[model samples]
Target: VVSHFNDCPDSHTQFCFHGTCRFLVQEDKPACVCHSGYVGARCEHADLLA
Candidate 1:
């Protein structure tokens, strides 16, 4: 997933404290996305250290 600041918890309505683990609406239907270094629901998992 590719999490975006705009999707961040404080950024919009959804939560993203750890990170965004939702579907990103693109040209296609919604797809799983999260921050580069984040994973899991709400981007709760850290894939790599900044």
Candidate 2:
């Protein structure tokens, strides 16, 4: 079973591994992994502007 959104390996893992969360791959919804310096349910996190 999956734990939480933060428990995912990558940002692309929107859906839970088991059944906790549901993953949907639609036309505009492409399964993807979050890039570096990014976090959260969406890939909208603070940037690495250092």
For candidate 1, give the lDDT of residue 22: 45
Q: How many collisions between residues are there in candidate 2? A: 3
Query: Candidate 2 — which residues are off by over 4 angstroms?
Result: 1-31, 47-50
Q: For model 2, how does the per-residue alpha-carbon lDDT over 1-50 read when each residue is reduced to its tens digit?
A: 44222332344454532223333433324333555565555555555672
For model 1, state the Cα shift of residue 39 in Å. 0.7
Cα error, residue 18 of model 2, in Å, equals 25
Please list all clashing residue pairs in model 2, or write none if there are none: 11-34, 12-32, 12-33
Q: What range of 10 consecutive residues in model 2 has the weakest lDDT sum?
A: 16-25
